[PDB]
Amino acid sequence: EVSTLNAQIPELKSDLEKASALNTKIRALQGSLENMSKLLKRQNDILQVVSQGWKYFKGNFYYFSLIPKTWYSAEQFCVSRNSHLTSVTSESEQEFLYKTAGGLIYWIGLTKAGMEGDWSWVDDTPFNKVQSARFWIPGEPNNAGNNEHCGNIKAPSLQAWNDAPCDKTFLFICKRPYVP
Amino acid sequence: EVSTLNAQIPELKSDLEKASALNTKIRALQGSLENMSKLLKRQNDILQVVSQGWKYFKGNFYYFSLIPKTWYSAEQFCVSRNSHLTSVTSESEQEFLYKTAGGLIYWIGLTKAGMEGDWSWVDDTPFNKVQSARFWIPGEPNNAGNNEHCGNIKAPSLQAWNDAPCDKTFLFICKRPYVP
Amino acid sequence: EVSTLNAQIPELKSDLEKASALNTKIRALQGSLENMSKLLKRQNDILQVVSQGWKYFKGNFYYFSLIPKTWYSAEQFCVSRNSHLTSVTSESEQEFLYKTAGGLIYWIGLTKAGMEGDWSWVDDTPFNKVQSARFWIPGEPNNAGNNEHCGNIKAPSLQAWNDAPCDKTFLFICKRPYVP
Amino acid sequence: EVSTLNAQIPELKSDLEKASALNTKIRALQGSLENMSKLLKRQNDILQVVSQGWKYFKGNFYYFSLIPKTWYSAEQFCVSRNSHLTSVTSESEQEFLYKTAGGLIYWIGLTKAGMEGDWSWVDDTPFNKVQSARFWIPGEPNNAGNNEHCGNIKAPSLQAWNDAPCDKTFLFICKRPYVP
Amino acid sequence: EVSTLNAQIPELKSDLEKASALNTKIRALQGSLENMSKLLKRQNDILQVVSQGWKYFKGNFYYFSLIPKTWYSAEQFCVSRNSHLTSVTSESEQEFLYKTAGGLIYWIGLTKAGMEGDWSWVDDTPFNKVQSARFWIPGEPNNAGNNEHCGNIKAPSLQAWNDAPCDKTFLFICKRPYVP
Amino acid sequence: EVSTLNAQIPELKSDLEKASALNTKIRALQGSLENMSKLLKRQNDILQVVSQGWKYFKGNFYYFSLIPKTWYSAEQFCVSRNSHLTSVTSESEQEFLYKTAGGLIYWIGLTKAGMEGDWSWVDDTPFNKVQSARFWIPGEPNNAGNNEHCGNIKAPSLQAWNDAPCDKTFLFICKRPYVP
């Protein structure tokens, strides 16, 4: 009866760490498969809008228009595309916008509003004077002829924003935030 | 010997139920892994065609041409691209076509046939008059000048189809179904 | 005690074989999950460049320019985009280039060097005379006016290369290899 | 009869020439007398308002208030005195205003208005950016707290204008043009 | 002798007409110069008192004190300045007084006398109840505490007179008539 | 010929007599008009300085400060106004100063100089101690605390001068002579 005990008790160990290891593997595998499922569904959601002629950058779909429209008409078209004239909130966003622009001028959300005519984004994004000055073309805004109250990206460089009358047609970047 | 049995028999229940759980987890993890492998290979199949200047929608690849050509010349080019002039079979197809068109005009598979000029699709897609009724521009088809026997999408709206002579150049949407 | 042995020894076979099966599962699953993780990260690396207006083919990103520039100006722009004028090294590359070109003309890395004007690639790619002859338009190179010392793809066919002076403006295909 | 002729003809010369001199005297003395008449009327008109505690400068009466009022209330009091918060249209105007101020702060016609919040004069005097540039205290306007939309003379120097909220009580310079 | 007579008679007539006209000039010019000399003398008389910090109105000199005094002390100071506390005999005088006051309160010649306490002027000016009725502040005189027996100009309006005990200090308007 | 002579002789006599009278009146009128023109020029010169809040007395312009300053700071301000701290050269000037002061305190040009500290005027006016003694407040100068080396006018009387330390802030009378 000694040999059977010296066989059973190590069986007790072996199956206890066996069950413990199986539990650890099941929990870790469940977590990892849930994470990869989220990753794949997010990627699939990414793919479709980009496949329909839209660009993507930092959680925003940007449609670089094939047809030119005026600042407010461009905003209307972007709204019809459930979007707005692109509002730049960072260095990287401006960089991507003027790089994908390929040298083309795109109306953006910049417009003079308020009692002081301060600049603002059409999509109600806050206008950071300090940050915006770095994105503005040198000498701009100058309000040439006192009629330059809308902004557009012209230069393929960080300082791409020029002020100009809202009334004239341009290509435009329709911006709508990514949502899962 | 009683303690040995009271140790052996619960070991029987434990290892039996745990091997059953092993069977369950093996089968579930397997089915999920071939499922995700199929999803991965399908998305890989999807991505390359889009990466080469093509658009995709509901299992069909649509090329919105950068060069305008006539109706039958566009059909020839699409055939050379293993495709055809896009035939519209659903609300979603027409919507996607005119939205990705971005206001541009694209030849489609609409063409008259026979002595009475019944409309039909070039890619042998059946043409349902009642179903295709609301896809036509109002007043169209009118066969203006009695020479309007091919269809093209102009308006960024559901009523975008217009009949017009087949002999003039326009942009075109080459359509070939996605095949894995 | 005989029944105890006849019950516990098969427990030995069962637990050893199931531990071996668990080992097989762990190793195979670990290898497969590492492989699919690598595939996922490579796919993520691929997708963003194409999502920003670029094309992709066999580990090389090709930007088909929206703005035309001369041979050396196009090379400068491509370098600014961390790339070069595309050098064609295979049948597949030439085919993809003239197919995604959509009938458009693009400057490539072809250039003459030295007093004898031996042809070569700008990106230091070796120039295969035998292979390149199959890619050159018939009658080309001809050095029309003794001034045609660069190369561009015009025809949507295998024999797409025509020689031309380096100083004339054309669209261009910026080429940079895919790096993980 | 010779002597009477030689006496009477020079009588003709003398009385004719002195009648001419009489005409010259009449015209000159007249012109001078009504000229000094208008001058005397103008000085009598000038003296009366000055005698009533008002100051005078280049055809404008400026009442340097003995009681402080807010910008809008100061304008109300000035209007009640058939005047307005003083505008500044010249170097001499600003100089006289801050010199007669004697170091005291006086509300002036400066106020932000219009879609761009541009500065303007309460008395409807046109406001020139370039002209009024040097009349502002250095660093002003700064719109401290984004609430400084009226102007007052503080410094006993050319750069006397500081922007401030219109709601603060200050001495004020009532301005009304001299009218004959 | 005929010609000399036909020259002499017009000589006499012209000499007589010229002499009469010169008499007209002499008399008219003498009268005008004497009148303007008197006016200039009066202007010189007027200007000197005003130049010494005094105000002037319709033949009276009014000193608006910079230091407050009690009613009787103010009267003593005015007497020392060869004047008296100002008495108001017309609407224009009251208007000038309160307008030059600029909202400030000034002791005036109002004082009660006799066992019934009838009001009167300190400078022996007759007191018109009917006229003074419209110069008192509405509700005044009320003789608050039965101790209000002196008058001061308070309001920036015609009804500026307020009654108060004579023992408190106010600014004061010393009044002395203009005499050539 | 008798009658014509008895008419000619009175003609000559009257013409000569009234010609002499015209000469006399011309000279007298010219002198009077030149004198009154000079007087009017002087009056126009006088009026402007007084019109800007300044006082005048016997060829000197005195500014009674609305803001107080220390003795040396008052002198600096007076110099900046092209003037100096007022010096007294006559009894009438002292009378005018303390009467226009209206009981207020004003710094004057009295200051000690040299190792014996003899008194003198800041504007280099000679010190008439014989006349100055009649203008000092009784008991003054006393040099209280051996630190009283400047002069101030406080008392509304001829004896208005008091010695006092130069470092404290009083009102001041800026004095500058009238020059045509």
Side-chain angles (χ1 to χ4, degrees):
Chain A
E1 293 179 354
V2 191
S3 65
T4 193
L5 271 172
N6 296 115
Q8 293 179 357
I9 311 167
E11 279 187 354
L12 307 182
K13 277 76 70 177
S14 176
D15 70 3
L16 63 84
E17 69 274 15
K18 186 258 189 180
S20 164
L22 297 180
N23 306 335
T24 70
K25 294 189 290 292
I26 293 312
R27 275 69 174 175
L29 191 63
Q30 202 177 6
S32 45
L33 64 89
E34 185 65 27
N35 296 117
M36 65 184 73
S37 299
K38 296 183 290 294
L39 294 174
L40 62 88
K41 63 176 70 67
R42 297 285 74 78
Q43 181 56 251
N44 295 336
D45 186 74
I46 301 299
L47 295 176
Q48 182 58 255
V49 177
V50 165
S51 277
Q52 299 175 234
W54 281 66
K55 315 286 194 305
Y56 182 73
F57 188 79
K58 54 156 60 72
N60 291 289
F61 286 117
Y62 308 84
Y63 172 76
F64 288 65
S65 74
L66 309 178
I67 182 177
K69 289 179 189 297
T70 69
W71 187 95
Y72 181 58
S73 291
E75 163 65 4
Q76 284 182 349
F77 176 95
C78 292
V79 167
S80 72
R81 301 283 191 271
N82 294 318
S83 72
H84 289 281
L85 289 181
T86 186
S87 54
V88 188
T89 68
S90 64
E91 177 66 25
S92 63
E93 190 179 3
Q94 167 80 345
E95 174 180 329
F96 152 82
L97 287 174
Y98 68 70
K99 284 195 168 188
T100 310
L104 303 178
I105 304 176
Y106 291 86
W107 272 130
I108 61 191
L110 291 179
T111 186
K112 285 179 188 143
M115 187 66 204
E116 295 295 328
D118 289 320
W119 283 94
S120 62
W121 291 115
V122 66
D123 65 353
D124 282 338
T125 302
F127 186 72
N128 189 335
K129 299 289 189 292
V130 181
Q131 180 189 56
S132 290
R134 189 182 66 251
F135 301 156
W136 273 100
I137 296 174
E140 322 300 334
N142 57 352
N143 195 11
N146 299 116
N147 192 38
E148 300 206 316
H149 321 312
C150 280
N152 56 40
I153 283 176
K154 295 185 170 67
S157 176
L158 184 61
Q159 296 184 291
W161 302 354
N162 176 41
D163 61 335
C166 310
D167 61 358
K168 59 189 173 301
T169 68
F170 274 108
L171 299 178
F172 48 92
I173 296 162
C174 293
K175 171 200 202 169
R176 66 192 214 291
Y178 184 76
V179 58
Chain B
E1 292 179 353
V2 191
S3 179
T4 61
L5 271 172
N6 296 115
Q8 278 152 358
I9 312 166
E11 277 188 353
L12 307 182
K13 277 74 69 177
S14 174
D15 67 2
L16 212 63
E17 62 85 19
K18 194 66 179 292
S20 163
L22 298 178
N23 311 336
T24 71
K25 61 175 68 67
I26 293 168
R27 275 69 174 174
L29 190 65
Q30 202 174 7
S32 44
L33 64 88
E34 293 83 4
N35 184 267
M36 64 184 73
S37 299
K38 294 184 285 290
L39 297 174
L40 185 147
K41 60 176 68 67
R42 297 285 74 78
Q43 58 81 13
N44 292 339
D45 295 346
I46 298 299
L47 291 177
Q48 284 74 242
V49 179
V50 164
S51 277
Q52 299 174 54
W54 278 65
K55 318 287 194 304
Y56 170 83
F57 192 82
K58 68 186 188 302
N60 292 288
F61 293 115
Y62 309 81
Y63 175 75
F64 288 64
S65 74
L66 308 177
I67 183 176
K69 295 194 287 185
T70 67
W71 187 94
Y72 183 59
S73 292
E75 161 65 3
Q76 286 180 351
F77 176 94
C78 293
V79 168
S80 71
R81 300 283 192 270
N82 195 38
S83 75
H84 286 281
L85 290 181
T86 186
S87 54
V88 189
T89 68
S90 65
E91 179 67 26
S92 63
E93 194 173 7
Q94 167 78 344
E95 174 180 330
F96 151 80
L97 288 175
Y98 72 73
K99 284 195 168 188
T100 308
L104 301 178
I105 304 177
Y106 291 86
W107 273 127
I108 61 190
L110 290 176
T111 189
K112 287 181 187 145
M115 183 278 288
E116 297 297 329
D118 293 320
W119 283 93
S120 62
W121 291 117
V122 64
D123 65 352
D124 283 338
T125 301
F127 185 71
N128 192 333
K129 308 269 166 142
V130 181
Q131 192 275 333
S132 292
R134 74 281 191 191
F135 296 160
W136 281 98
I137 297 174
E140 318 297 334
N142 60 351
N143 197 11
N146 300 116
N147 193 38
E148 302 206 318
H149 321 311
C150 279
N152 55 39
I153 286 175
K154 297 185 174 68
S157 176
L158 187 62
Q159 299 186 293
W161 298 353
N162 177 42
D163 63 334
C166 309
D167 63 358
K168 60 189 174 301
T169 66
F170 273 106
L171 299 177
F172 47 90
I173 297 162
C174 292
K175 171 201 203 169
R176 63 176 181 268
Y178 164 52
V179 293
Chain C
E1 293 179 354
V2 191
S3 65
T4 76
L5 270 166
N6 312 337
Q8 65 183 177
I9 308 166
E11 278 188 353
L12 306 183
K13 278 77 70 177
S14 175
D15 74 7
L16 65 86
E17 61 85 20
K18 78 183 324 191
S20 162
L22 299 178
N23 307 336
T24 70
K25 288 179 66 65
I26 300 150
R27 275 69 174 175
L29 189 63
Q30 203 176 6
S32 45
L33 64 89
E34 297 297 328
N35 183 266
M36 65 184 73
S37 299
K38 294 184 285 290
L39 294 174
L40 188 148
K41 51 192 82 150
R42 298 285 74 78
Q43 183 60 254
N44 295 339
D45 296 346
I46 297 299
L47 289 171
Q48 283 74 242
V49 178
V50 165
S51 277
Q52 299 174 54
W54 280 65
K55 316 287 193 304
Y56 171 83
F57 189 80
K58 68 186 188 302
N60 292 289
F61 294 116
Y62 308 81
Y63 171 75
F64 288 65
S65 72
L66 308 177
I67 182 177
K69 287 185 284 292
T70 65
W71 190 94
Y72 185 61
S73 292
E75 163 66 4
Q76 285 182 351
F77 178 96
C78 292
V79 168
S80 71
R81 301 283 192 271
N82 195 38
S83 74
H84 286 281
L85 289 180
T86 185
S87 54
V88 188
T89 68
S90 65
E91 179 66 25
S92 64
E93 194 171 7
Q94 168 81 344
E95 173 181 330
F96 152 80
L97 287 174
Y98 71 71
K99 285 195 168 188
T100 309
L104 301 179
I105 303 178
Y106 293 87
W107 271 130
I108 61 190
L110 292 176
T111 189
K112 287 181 186 144
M115 183 278 288
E116 299 298 330
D118 291 319
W119 283 96
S120 62
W121 291 118
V122 63
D123 65 352
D124 283 338
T125 301
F127 184 67
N128 189 335
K129 302 296 201 213
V130 181
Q131 180 189 236
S132 290
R134 191 182 66 252
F135 301 156
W136 276 98
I137 296 174
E140 321 301 335
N142 59 351
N143 196 11
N146 299 115
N147 192 38
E148 301 203 316
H149 321 312
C150 281
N152 54 39
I153 285 175
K154 296 185 173 68
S157 176
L158 182 59
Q159 295 186 291
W161 302 354
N162 175 40
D163 59 338
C166 305
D167 63 358
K168 324 173 299 318
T169 298
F170 289 96
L171 296 176
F172 49 89
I173 297 162
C174 293
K175 171 201 202 169
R176 67 192 213 292
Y178 165 52
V179 303
Chain D
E1 292 179 353
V2 191
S3 179
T4 192
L5 270 168
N6 311 157
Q8 66 183 357
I9 316 165
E11 276 190 353
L12 307 183
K13 266 83 74 173
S14 176
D15 68 4
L16 212 63
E17 62 85 19
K18 208 164 193 180
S20 162
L22 183 152
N23 309 336
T24 71
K25 181 180 287 293
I26 293 309
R27 275 69 174 175
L29 193 64
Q30 203 174 8
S32 45
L33 63 89
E34 66 270 13
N35 186 267
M36 64 184 73
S37 298
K38 272 78 72 177
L39 187 81
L40 186 147
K41 293 186 288 292
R42 297 285 74 78
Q43 63 87 29
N44 288 340
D45 291 347
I46 295 300
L47 294 174
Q48 292 178 335
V49 177
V50 164
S51 277
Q52 299 174 54
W54 281 63
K55 315 287 192 304
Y56 177 72
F57 190 80
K58 68 186 187 302
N60 289 289
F61 295 116
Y62 307 83
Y63 175 78
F64 286 65
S65 73
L66 308 177
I67 183 177
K69 286 180 186 296
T70 66
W71 191 94
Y72 183 60
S73 291
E75 165 66 5
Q76 285 182 351
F77 178 95
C78 291
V79 168
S80 72
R81 302 284 191 271
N82 196 38
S83 73
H84 288 281
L85 288 181
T86 185
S87 53
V88 187
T89 68
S90 64
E91 271 294 341
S92 64
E93 196 170 9
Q94 168 79 344
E95 174 180 330
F96 151 80
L97 287 174
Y98 72 74
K99 284 195 168 187
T100 309
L104 300 178
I105 303 177
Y106 290 85
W107 272 132
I108 61 190
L110 289 176
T111 187
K112 286 182 188 146
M115 187 66 204
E116 294 294 328
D118 291 322
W119 285 94
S120 62
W121 291 117
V122 66
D123 64 353
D124 282 338
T125 301
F127 189 70
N128 191 332
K129 305 289 98 175
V130 180
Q131 181 187 356
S132 291
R134 75 280 190 190
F135 293 157
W136 278 97
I137 297 175
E140 321 300 335
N142 58 352
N143 196 12
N146 298 115
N147 192 37
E148 304 204 316
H149 320 311
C150 282
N152 55 39
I153 284 175
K154 295 186 173 68
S157 177
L158 190 63
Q159 297 184 293
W161 300 353
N162 176 39
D163 58 336
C166 309
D167 63 358
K168 294 187 296 299
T169 67
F170 286 105
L171 300 177
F172 49 91
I173 296 163
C174 294
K175 172 200 203 169
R176 68 192 214 292
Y178 164 52
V179 298
Chain E
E1 293 179 354
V2 190
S3 179
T4 193
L5 271 172
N6 296 115
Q8 280 149 0
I9 312 162
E11 273 187 351
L12 304 182
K13 301 296 182 182
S14 176
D15 186 285
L16 212 62
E17 185 69 32
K18 188 175 180 178
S20 164
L22 293 176
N23 306 336
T24 71
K25 268 86 75 175
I26 295 164
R27 275 69 174 174
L29 192 62
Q30 202 177 7
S32 45
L33 65 89
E34 183 64 26
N35 183 267
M36 61 79 71
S37 299
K38 297 184 288 291
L39 188 80
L40 187 148
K41 293 166 150 210
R42 302 288 77 75
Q43 184 61 254
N44 291 339
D45 295 346
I46 297 299
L47 291 173
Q48 293 177 335
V49 177
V50 164
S51 277
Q52 299 174 54
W54 279 63
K55 316 286 193 304
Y56 169 83
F57 183 81
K58 293 185 182 178
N60 290 289
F61 294 117
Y62 307 81
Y63 175 77
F64 287 64
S65 73
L66 307 177
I67 183 177
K69 286 179 185 296
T70 63
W71 190 95
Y72 185 60
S73 291
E75 163 66 5
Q76 284 183 351
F77 179 94
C78 292
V79 167
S80 71
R81 302 283 193 271
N82 196 38
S83 75
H84 289 281
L85 289 180
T86 185
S87 54
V88 189
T89 67
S90 63
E91 181 180 1
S92 63
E93 191 178 3
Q94 168 79 344
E95 175 179 330
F96 152 80
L97 287 175
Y98 75 76
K99 284 195 168 187
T100 309
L104 300 179
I105 309 176
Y106 289 86
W107 273 130
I108 62 189
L110 293 175
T111 189
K112 287 182 189 146
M115 171 285 318
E116 296 296 329
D118 292 320
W119 284 95
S120 63
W121 291 116
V122 63
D123 65 353
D124 282 338
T125 301
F127 188 70
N128 191 335
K129 315 289 173 163
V130 181
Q131 182 187 56
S132 289
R134 63 184 176 90
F135 298 157
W136 280 98
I137 298 175
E140 316 295 336
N142 57 351
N143 195 12
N146 300 115
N147 193 38
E148 303 204 316
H149 320 311
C150 281
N152 56 40
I153 287 175
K154 190 181 174 74
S157 177
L158 184 64
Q159 298 184 295
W161 300 353
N162 175 43
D163 61 336
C166 307
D167 63 358
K168 65 182 71 63
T169 65
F170 282 109
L171 299 177
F172 49 90
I173 297 163
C174 294
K175 171 200 202 169
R176 68 192 212 292
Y178 166 51
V179 58
Chain F
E1 292 179 353
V2 190
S3 179
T4 192
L5 272 173
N6 296 115
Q8 279 150 359
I9 312 163
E11 273 190 352
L12 304 182
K13 301 296 182 182
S14 176
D15 186 284
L16 213 62
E17 179 68 33
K18 204 165 190 178
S20 163
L22 297 177
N23 309 336
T24 68
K25 61 174 64 64
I26 293 168
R27 274 69 173 175
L29 190 63
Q30 202 178 7
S32 44
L33 65 89
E34 194 74 327
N35 183 267
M36 61 79 71
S37 298
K38 296 184 288 291
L39 188 81
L40 186 148
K41 292 166 150 210
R42 302 288 77 75
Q43 182 59 253
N44 290 339
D45 293 347
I46 297 300
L47 291 174
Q48 183 60 255
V49 178
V50 164
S51 277
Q52 299 174 234
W54 279 63
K55 317 286 193 304
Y56 170 83
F57 181 81
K58 293 185 182 178
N60 290 289
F61 293 117
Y62 307 81
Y63 174 77
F64 287 64
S65 72
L66 306 177
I67 182 177
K69 286 179 185 296
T70 63
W71 192 95
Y72 187 62
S73 291
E75 164 67 5
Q76 285 183 352
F77 180 94
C78 291
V79 168
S80 72
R81 301 282 194 271
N82 195 38
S83 75
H84 289 280
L85 289 180
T86 185
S87 54
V88 189
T89 68
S90 64
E91 192 277 331
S92 63
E93 191 178 3
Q94 166 80 344
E95 174 180 329
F96 153 80
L97 287 174
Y98 74 75
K99 284 195 168 188
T100 309
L104 301 179
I105 308 176
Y106 291 88
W107 276 130
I108 62 189
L110 291 175
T111 189
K112 287 181 188 146
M115 181 295 308
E116 296 296 329
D118 291 319
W119 284 94
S120 62
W121 290 115
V122 62
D123 66 353
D124 282 338
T125 301
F127 187 73
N128 191 335
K129 59 94 175 177
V130 180
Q131 182 186 236
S132 289
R134 190 181 65 250
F135 302 156
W136 280 99
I137 297 175
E140 320 298 336
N142 56 351
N143 195 12
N146 299 115
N147 193 39
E148 301 204 317
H149 321 310
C150 280
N152 54 37
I153 287 176
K154 293 188 285 291
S157 177
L158 187 62
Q159 297 184 294
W161 299 353
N162 176 44
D163 59 336
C166 304
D167 63 358
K168 56 185 175 296
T169 300
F170 287 161
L171 296 175
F172 51 91
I173 297 163
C174 295
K175 171 201 202 169
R176 68 192 213 291
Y178 166 51
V179 58

